[PDB]
Amino acid sequence: PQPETLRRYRAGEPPLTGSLLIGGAGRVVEPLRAALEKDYDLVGADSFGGLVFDATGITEPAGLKGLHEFFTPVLRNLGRCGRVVVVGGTPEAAASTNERIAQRALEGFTRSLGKELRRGATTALVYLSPDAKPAATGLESTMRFLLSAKSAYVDGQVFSVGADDSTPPADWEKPLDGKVAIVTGAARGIGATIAEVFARDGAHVVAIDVESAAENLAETASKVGGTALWLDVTADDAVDKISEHLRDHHGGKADILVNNAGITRDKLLANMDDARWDAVLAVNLLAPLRLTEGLVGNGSIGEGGRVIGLSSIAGIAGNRGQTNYATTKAGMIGITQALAPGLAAKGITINAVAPGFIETQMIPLATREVGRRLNSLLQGGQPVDVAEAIAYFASPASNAVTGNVIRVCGQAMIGA
Amino acid sequence: PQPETLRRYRAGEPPLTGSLLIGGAGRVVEPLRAALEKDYDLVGADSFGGLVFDATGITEPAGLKGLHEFFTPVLRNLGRCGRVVVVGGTPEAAASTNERIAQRALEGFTRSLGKELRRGATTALVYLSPDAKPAATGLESTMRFLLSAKSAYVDGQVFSVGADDSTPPADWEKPLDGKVAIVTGAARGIGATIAEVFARDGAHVVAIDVESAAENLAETASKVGGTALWLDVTADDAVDKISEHLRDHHGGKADILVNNAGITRDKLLANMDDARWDAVLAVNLLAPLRLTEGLVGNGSIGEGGRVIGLSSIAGIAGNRGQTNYATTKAGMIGITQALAPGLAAKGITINAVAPGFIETQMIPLATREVGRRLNSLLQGGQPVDVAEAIAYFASPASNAVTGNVIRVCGQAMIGA
Ligand SMILES: NC(=O)c1ccc[n+]([C@@H]2O[C@H](COP(=O)([O-])OP(=O)(O)OC[C@H]3O[C@@H](n4cnc5c(N)ncnc54)[C@H](O)[C@@H]3O)[C@@H](O)[C@H]2O)c1
Ligand SMILES: NC(=O)c1ccc[n+]([C@@H]2O[C@H](COP(=O)([O-])OP(=O)(O)OC[C@H]3O[C@@H](n4cnc5c(N)ncnc54)[C@H](O)[C@@H]3O)[C@@H](O)[C@H]2O)c1
């Protein structure tokens, strides 16, 4: 069992390595073909780049034989870095309990199969609101993300698309064109690569980070063709300083806030001081809350808005030595779920990305060299992978995706 | 880092190895003291058998310093096989978004700390409906379970108690006294130990299993002082045969159905025949659905009823070689969540238990000897541990606990 060269995004290459087959039965197979004829290579015999099963048709548990009939033949013929996606209906919203039971069981299918795919290929489960108009324009951003090299490190996860219709962006290849994005913690690591990706996709980045970071930040802003605001997100006046920086540079409006800045102060709870607790709570939790309410509250972010939070696998599964940190990363899941209704009223989505083992950076190089393999893809991921998920949510056309938590972990063995 | 001798249940011993401290602030600290003065050794300096933090008081994220102030002193003083429990308010039902954010973040705290406790001790998070009457009689079955040797292999999990009031059973030491319990798959393994535990707690067991099992089943029925019904739960007439067996033996009524019978037919989806798919779907999924609707539908199980399903970690995290099996075990989570409302209307709860690495039985004795350690408690569990969780749900006084999925896994590293 050997790790694949994961194909990542590169401009001009086709989204998939092969052709796209779209089986199954229900309200999605048809309109999905129609929406993806243009940019994909539809079947139809020869190396598959992506299998997609419409599951919405399955209305009772006996129906689940369907996955077997569609998948078992085609699997041996799945490409390098191919993409399996099962599209179902939101289980809570089904028309009968029988249907709810069947759609729920799919998660068990998609996650088990993710652990069988070979040569870097991945599975995904996507639920779609049964209130979605038949075109399902609300579903395109998610399918376009999953069926591409962009999702390289996203594996085994569950996306949940709502009812609202979506406008496609002017150019799918540059989706954040003309958007203004605030990135906290942009001097280095994942935060900087978010700036890059956001820039790549056409956005103007406000790159925020502390005085200490000094110039690492300017290097990042110059690199992405953005601006640099040297600010401690925990400062009593962070909201003022940002709204003001926006007033100068972008007429007082911003489209995307990425709450990426974070710290750790790992200690066992037993030997844990107030400063290790309080310092972590302040950056990772209070500030993202305060910044999001702040910025929406004064009109800096309005209709069409996007808030994305950085959660973590620790927030989901816990981790030894991180009761503080994990509280914050679960807290961030808390922000995403609690504010989703309010913000939806205001035309704003909010979603979270939960990284697993990312290389730049991750601790004894005795546990490093192991924890990096403990996932279906057998390798550690890269900042760009996490940034791509984040760019997906930021998309002008991801307006029907809110309240989601997606791990970017290559289906890491660990979880709740 | 070395595995503890887990203290399991034994009649007459005290529920805890030490004294019970109940800190924190909110609507639960007081009434909880009152309800547990009688059977527990309340503080108050010397070896703690159980720490319990009332979290319901925490209404904004800055509040979360509370866990730190209560836990950091007391932790070094935690007994052998001690029990940490944080009791919070259902996050969805909070009065403000701020409170929802704080109560949500607790999960991250309880799971991270579970990975730090020493010498077999465990954490649990329990949410309580803010509609619960101040006495919180609905919460006693859960606290009594967690704070005992009975929960020996339950670690890091999340329980969710509703609003309804509860009557205590006549004798807490024999909670299923006079109840009639149907156990499927009782000839051996976990199913038989459920019969034992159910018998121990005063119940009359109908022990069901196939013809093949022949006598293993009679040995179990004679052992528990029950009756033996030799029946393939997938048979077109399983519901008739059981209602009829009940008509003879228990005046046509049963109080508890345990949907424990299951099989595997592990194969990779790629090389998977119809019979490995269909055979597994039929026992593990269609039959538990058909049996529960069947038995409630003809009045065999009525008000005061209890349905408990056997799910699995595979159903939650997936597993290689088990797309069929995991579909069923996720399916079983599907049954528990889909039927909870309907059945609640009828005075019936339904809940699921998801075992992890249980010894009798679990595959190469090269992966056995590893997978058994991959959990906070560093050892594989035992059938009795799984049966105890199940007996907890069956309790006459667990009427405010429905729709729950609890893993019995000693906080196994693997999950979603
Ligand atoms: N594998 C890991 O990197 C991993 C895993 C899970 C989650 N995450 C999360 O993803 C995010 C990125 O982590 P990273 O690996 O790039 O670490 P990093 O430490 O390299 O990057 C964080 C940046 O945030 C900045 N920052 C810290 N406090 C700040 C403050 N108060 N105000 C403004 N800026 C501040 C730091 O200067 C730093 O430049 C974090 O939120 C982290 O918690 C990381
Ligand atoms: N560690 C593991 O044991 C583990 C892990 C997770 C979940 N589970 C689940 O817990 C339950 C118990 O498993 P077990 O380890 O005791 O395995 P087991 O095979 O020893 O016990 C199952 C019993 O069910 C009986 N049975 C099978 N099909 C039946 C049918 N159609 N009708 C009536 N009886 C039938 C079998 O005869 C057997 O006696 C199963 O549902 C299993 O899926 C087990």
Tab-separated table of C-alpha atoms in Angstrom, chain A residues 70-349:
chain	number	residue	atom	x	y	z
A	70	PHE	CA	-23.441	1.102	-9.847
A	71	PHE	CA	-20.140	0.909	-8.030
A	72	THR	CA	-18.855	-2.692	-8.164
A	73	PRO	CA	-18.357	-2.841	-11.995
A	74	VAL	CA	-16.838	0.624	-12.468
A	75	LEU	CA	-14.381	0.708	-9.493
A	76	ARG	CA	-11.437	-1.193	-11.080
A	77	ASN	CA	-11.619	1.462	-13.868
A	78	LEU	CA	-11.092	4.480	-11.575
A	79	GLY	CA	-8.294	6.867	-12.433
A	80	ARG	CA	-5.370	8.249	-10.595
A	81	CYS	CA	-6.765	10.923	-8.192
A	82	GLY	CA	-10.298	10.154	-9.171
A	83	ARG	CA	-13.302	11.445	-7.366
A	84	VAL	CA	-16.288	9.474	-6.109
A	85	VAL	CA	-19.351	11.530	-5.106
A	86	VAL	CA	-22.717	10.257	-3.852
A	87	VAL	CA	-25.376	12.932	-3.938
A	88	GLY	CA	-28.321	12.358	-1.607
A	89	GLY	CA	-31.198	14.170	0.003
A	90	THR	CA	-30.869	15.904	3.396
A	91	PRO	CA	-31.974	13.088	5.727
A	92	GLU	CA	-33.916	15.362	8.243
A	93	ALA	CA	-36.036	16.662	5.333
A	94	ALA	CA	-37.069	13.399	3.746
A	95	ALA	CA	-40.730	12.654	2.995
A	96	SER	CA	-40.818	9.439	4.969
A	97	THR	CA	-38.821	7.909	7.818
A	98	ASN	CA	-37.847	5.125	5.444
A	99	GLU	CA	-36.157	7.651	3.148
A	100	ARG	CA	-34.457	9.352	6.095
A	101	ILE	CA	-33.060	5.947	7.156
A	102	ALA	CA	-31.686	5.227	3.691
A	103	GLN	CA	-30.138	8.634	3.064
A	104	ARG	CA	-28.503	8.555	6.485
A	105	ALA	CA	-26.930	5.200	5.864
A	106	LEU	CA	-25.060	6.589	2.861
A	107	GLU	CA	-22.463	8.265	5.091
A	108	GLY	CA	-21.401	4.804	6.219
A	109	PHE	CA	-21.023	3.819	2.515
A	110	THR	CA	-19.017	6.857	1.336
A	111	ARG	CA	-16.622	6.739	4.323
A	112	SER	CA	-16.026	2.986	4.059
A	113	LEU	CA	-15.312	3.239	0.304
A	114	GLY	CA	-12.918	6.176	0.803
A	115	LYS	CA	-10.829	3.645	2.750
A	116	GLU	CA	-10.742	1.213	-0.276
A	117	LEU	CA	-10.015	3.579	-3.254
A	118	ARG	CA	-6.503	3.285	-4.634
A	119	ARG	CA	-3.868	5.637	-5.957
A	120	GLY	CA	-4.978	8.897	-4.308
A	121	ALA	CA	-8.699	8.746	-5.243
A	122	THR	CA	-11.313	10.118	-2.888
A	123	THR	CA	-15.007	9.854	-1.955
A	124	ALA	CA	-17.468	12.561	-0.944
A	125	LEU	CA	-21.115	12.588	0.222
A	126	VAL	CA	-23.212	15.609	-0.598
A	127	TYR	CA	-26.752	16.135	0.642
A	128	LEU	CA	-29.132	18.389	-1.293
A	129	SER	CA	-32.265	20.033	0.118
A	130	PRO	CA	-35.383	18.468	-1.394
A	131	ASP	CA	-36.679	22.094	-1.665
A	132	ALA	CA	-33.995	22.813	-4.256
A	133	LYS	CA	-35.364	23.864	-7.685
A	134	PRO	CA	-34.868	21.011	-10.278
A	135	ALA	CA	-31.966	22.790	-12.010
A	136	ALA	CA	-30.066	22.582	-8.653
A	137	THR	CA	-27.906	25.619	-9.422
A	138	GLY	CA	-27.202	25.691	-5.685
A	139	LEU	CA	-25.162	22.470	-6.096
A	140	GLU	CA	-22.660	23.489	-8.791
A	141	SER	CA	-19.987	25.161	-6.705
A	142	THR	CA	-19.713	21.957	-4.580
A	143	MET	CA	-19.599	19.518	-7.463
A	144	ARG	CA	-17.096	21.739	-9.309
A	145	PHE	CA	-14.902	21.747	-6.186
A	146	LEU	CA	-15.083	18.044	-5.524
A	147	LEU	CA	-14.580	17.050	-9.150
A	148	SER	CA	-11.209	18.833	-9.570
A	149	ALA	CA	-7.611	18.701	-8.373
A	150	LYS	CA	-8.564	21.406	-5.913
A	151	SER	CA	-10.097	18.888	-3.473
A	152	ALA	CA	-6.842	16.871	-3.443
A	153	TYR	CA	-6.776	16.499	0.394
A	154	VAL	CA	-10.505	16.392	1.086
A	155	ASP	CA	-11.633	12.808	1.536
A	156	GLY	CA	-14.569	11.078	3.088
A	157	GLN	CA	-16.390	14.191	4.109
A	158	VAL	CA	-20.042	15.318	4.074
A	159	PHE	CA	-21.265	18.491	2.448
A	160	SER	CA	-24.769	19.860	2.953
A	161	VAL	CA	-26.291	22.146	0.314
A	162	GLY	CA	-29.537	24.086	1.070
A	163	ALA	CA	-32.485	25.253	-1.092
A	164	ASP	CA	-31.476	28.686	-2.596
A	165	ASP	CA	-30.699	29.182	-6.289
A	166	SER	CA	-27.169	30.226	-7.411
A	167	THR	CA	-25.726	32.573	-10.040
A	168	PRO	CA	-22.545	31.250	-11.692
A	169	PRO	CA	-19.541	33.522	-11.365
A	170	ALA	CA	-18.542	35.439	-14.550
A	171	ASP	CA	-15.495	33.124	-14.899
A	172	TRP	CA	-15.352	29.795	-13.052
A	173	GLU	CA	-11.546	29.872	-13.430
A	174	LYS	CA	-11.348	33.161	-11.473
A	175	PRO	CA	-14.332	32.896	-9.028
A	176	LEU	CA	-13.326	35.590	-6.509
A	177	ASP	CA	-12.847	38.205	-9.288
A	178	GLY	CA	-13.514	41.663	-7.848
A	179	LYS	CA	-14.150	40.353	-4.299
A	180	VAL	CA	-12.380	41.827	-1.284
A	181	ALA	CA	-11.160	39.281	1.209
A	182	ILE	CA	-9.812	39.817	4.750
A	183	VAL	CA	-7.331	37.134	5.894
A	184	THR	CA	-6.248	37.042	9.521
A	185	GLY	CA	-2.871	35.497	10.282
A	186	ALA	CA	-1.543	36.006	6.740
A	187	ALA	CA	2.202	36.500	7.482
A	188	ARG	CA	2.982	32.818	7.096
A	189	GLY	CA	1.782	29.171	7.063
A	190	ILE	CA	-1.787	28.389	5.936
A	191	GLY	CA	-2.843	32.048	6.202
A	192	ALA	CA	-0.345	33.194	3.549
A	193	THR	CA	-1.352	30.415	1.125
A	194	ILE	CA	-4.981	31.549	1.509
A	195	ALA	CA	-3.894	35.018	0.405
A	196	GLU	CA	-2.165	33.365	-2.588
A	197	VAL	CA	-5.104	31.219	-3.568
A	198	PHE	CA	-7.542	34.149	-3.016
A	199	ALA	CA	-5.308	36.292	-5.275
A	200	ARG	CA	-5.073	33.497	-7.892
A	201	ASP	CA	-8.894	33.435	-8.038
A	202	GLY	CA	-9.047	37.258	-8.514
A	203	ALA	CA	-9.568	38.722	-5.059
A	204	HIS	CA	-8.014	41.698	-3.287
A	205	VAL	CA	-6.655	40.552	-0.011
A	206	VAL	CA	-6.344	42.464	3.203
A	207	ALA	CA	-3.643	40.547	4.975
A	208	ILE	CA	-3.710	40.957	8.781
A	209	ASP	CA	-1.050	39.870	11.352
A	210	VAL	CA	0.832	41.076	14.438
A	211	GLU	CA	3.626	43.648	14.674
A	212	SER	CA	6.109	40.798	15.463
A	213	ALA	CA	5.438	39.290	11.981
A	214	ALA	CA	6.708	42.560	10.517
A	215	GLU	CA	7.530	42.247	6.785
A	216	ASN	CA	6.748	38.561	6.472
A	217	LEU	CA	3.338	40.195	6.111
A	218	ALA	CA	4.516	42.874	3.677
A	219	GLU	CA	6.168	40.100	1.632
A	220	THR	CA	2.895	38.274	1.545
A	221	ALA	CA	0.840	41.431	0.569
A	222	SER	CA	3.281	42.456	-2.172
A	223	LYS	CA	3.290	38.796	-3.353
A	224	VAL	CA	-0.554	38.651	-3.636
A	225	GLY	CA	-0.959	42.240	-4.820
A	226	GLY	CA	-2.790	43.184	-1.637
A	227	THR	CA	-2.461	45.413	1.403
A	228	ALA	CA	-0.953	44.748	4.797
A	229	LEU	CA	-2.626	45.637	8.093
A	230	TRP	CA	-0.416	45.022	11.124
A	231	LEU	CA	-3.000	44.300	13.864
A	232	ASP	CA	-3.420	41.992	16.879
A	233	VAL	CA	-6.934	40.570	16.261
A	234	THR	CA	-7.457	40.506	20.053
A	235	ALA	CA	-6.837	44.285	20.466
A	236	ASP	CA	-9.902	46.019	22.001
A	237	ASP	CA	-10.199	48.033	18.764
A	238	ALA	CA	-9.615	45.427	16.008
A	239	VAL	CA	-12.998	46.006	14.405
A	240	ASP	CA	-12.409	49.802	14.193
A	241	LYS	CA	-8.952	49.425	12.677
A	242	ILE	CA	-10.183	47.027	9.986
A	243	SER	CA	-13.276	49.030	9.077
A	244	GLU	CA	-11.025	52.011	8.806
A	245	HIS	CA	-8.431	50.231	6.627
A	246	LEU	CA	-11.376	49.218	4.463
A	247	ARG	CA	-12.571	52.821	4.357
A	248	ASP	CA	-9.254	53.877	2.805
A	249	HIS	CA	-8.713	50.979	0.495
A	250	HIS	CA	-12.052	49.419	-0.574
A	251	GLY	CA	-14.806	52.010	0.022
A	252	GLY	CA	-15.576	50.498	3.439
A	253	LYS	CA	-16.799	47.114	2.094
A	254	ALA	CA	-15.341	43.554	2.308
A	255	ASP	CA	-16.884	40.374	0.879
A	256	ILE	CA	-14.939	37.620	2.728
A	257	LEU	CA	-13.548	37.333	6.270
A	258	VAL	CA	-11.218	34.432	6.954
A	259	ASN	CA	-10.678	33.830	10.650
A	260	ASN	CA	-7.408	31.995	10.272
A	261	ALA	CA	-5.112	33.536	12.928
A	262	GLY	CA	-4.560	31.111	15.784
A	263	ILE	CA	-2.029	30.030	18.432
A	264	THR	CA	-1.406	27.025	20.651
A	265	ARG	CA	-0.136	26.952	24.230
A	266	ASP	CA	-0.187	23.179	24.836
A	267	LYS	CA	-0.062	21.978	28.418
A	268	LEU	CA	-1.866	19.242	30.291
A	269	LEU	CA	-4.926	20.696	32.020
A	270	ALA	CA	-3.417	19.479	35.284
A	271	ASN	CA	-0.317	21.711	35.077
A	272	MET	CA	-2.140	24.571	33.245
A	273	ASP	CA	-1.790	28.316	34.104
A	274	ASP	CA	-4.361	31.103	33.413
A	275	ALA	CA	-2.176	32.603	30.670
A	276	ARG	CA	-2.079	29.402	28.570
A	277	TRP	CA	-5.819	29.121	28.900
A	278	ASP	CA	-6.671	32.797	28.448
A	279	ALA	CA	-4.182	33.533	25.686
A	280	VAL	CA	-5.552	30.674	23.546
A	281	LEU	CA	-9.236	31.489	24.196
A	282	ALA	CA	-8.600	35.111	23.199
A	283	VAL	CA	-7.045	34.596	19.753
A	284	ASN	CA	-8.768	31.425	18.637
A	285	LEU	CA	-12.336	32.026	19.888
A	286	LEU	CA	-13.328	35.458	21.281
A	287	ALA	CA	-11.651	37.386	18.494
A	288	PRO	CA	-13.215	35.432	15.605
A	289	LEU	CA	-16.614	35.885	17.265
A	290	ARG	CA	-16.019	39.567	18.029
A	291	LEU	CA	-14.642	40.199	14.506
A	292	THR	CA	-17.545	38.577	12.686
A	293	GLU	CA	-20.307	40.267	14.755
A	294	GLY	CA	-18.231	43.435	14.644
A	295	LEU	CA	-17.815	43.513	10.903
A	296	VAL	CA	-21.323	42.484	9.961
A	297	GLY	CA	-22.782	44.751	12.673
A	298	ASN	CA	-21.328	47.974	11.207
A	299	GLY	CA	-22.097	47.019	7.603
A	300	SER	CA	-18.482	46.248	6.525
A	301	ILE	CA	-19.691	42.830	5.364
A	302	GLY	CA	-23.206	42.759	3.930
A	303	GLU	CA	-25.344	40.804	1.524
A	304	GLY	CA	-23.308	38.265	-0.515
A	305	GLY	CA	-20.928	37.948	2.449
A	306	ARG	CA	-18.705	35.011	3.337
A	307	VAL	CA	-17.222	34.116	6.699
A	308	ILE	CA	-14.928	31.103	6.892
A	309	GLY	CA	-13.468	29.771	10.144
A	310	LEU	CA	-10.407	27.656	10.821
A	311	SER	CA	-11.435	24.784	13.025
A	312	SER	CA	-9.350	21.646	13.653
A	313	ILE	CA	-9.429	17.837	14.039
A	314	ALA	CA	-8.549	18.556	17.672
A	315	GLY	CA	-11.840	20.437	17.964
A	316	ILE	CA	-13.649	17.324	16.699
A	317	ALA	CA	-11.716	14.462	18.339
A	318	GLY	CA	-9.876	16.230	21.109
A	319	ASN	CA	-6.182	15.955	21.657
A	320	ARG	CA	-3.844	15.300	24.546
A	321	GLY	CA	-2.380	18.494	25.953
A	322	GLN	CA	-4.885	20.796	24.249
A	323	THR	CA	-8.015	21.171	26.359
A	324	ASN	CA	-7.700	24.911	25.675
A	325	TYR	CA	-7.009	24.818	21.960
A	326	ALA	CA	-9.666	22.096	21.274
A	327	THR	CA	-12.184	24.137	23.232
A	328	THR	CA	-11.479	26.959	20.831
A	329	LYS	CA	-11.646	24.801	17.696
A	330	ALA	CA	-14.911	23.212	18.811
A	331	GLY	CA	-15.887	26.795	19.734
A	332	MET	CA	-15.292	27.729	16.116
A	333	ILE	CA	-17.692	24.953	15.069
A	334	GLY	CA	-19.966	26.630	17.622
A	335	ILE	CA	-19.678	29.990	15.822
A	336	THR	CA	-20.448	28.406	12.456
A	337	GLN	CA	-23.539	26.555	13.659
A	338	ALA	CA	-24.896	29.316	15.958
A	339	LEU	CA	-24.636	32.279	13.509
A	340	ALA	CA	-25.763	30.403	10.308
A	341	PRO	CA	-29.529	31.284	10.677
A	342	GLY	CA	-29.005	34.990	11.662
A	343	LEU	CA	-26.466	35.600	8.904
A	344	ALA	CA	-28.579	33.701	6.303
A	345	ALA	CA	-31.300	36.274	6.982
A	346	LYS	CA	-28.692	38.897	6.005
A	347	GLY	CA	-27.503	37.125	2.825
A	348	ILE	CA	-24.307	35.805	4.483
A	349	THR	CA	-22.939	32.228	4.734
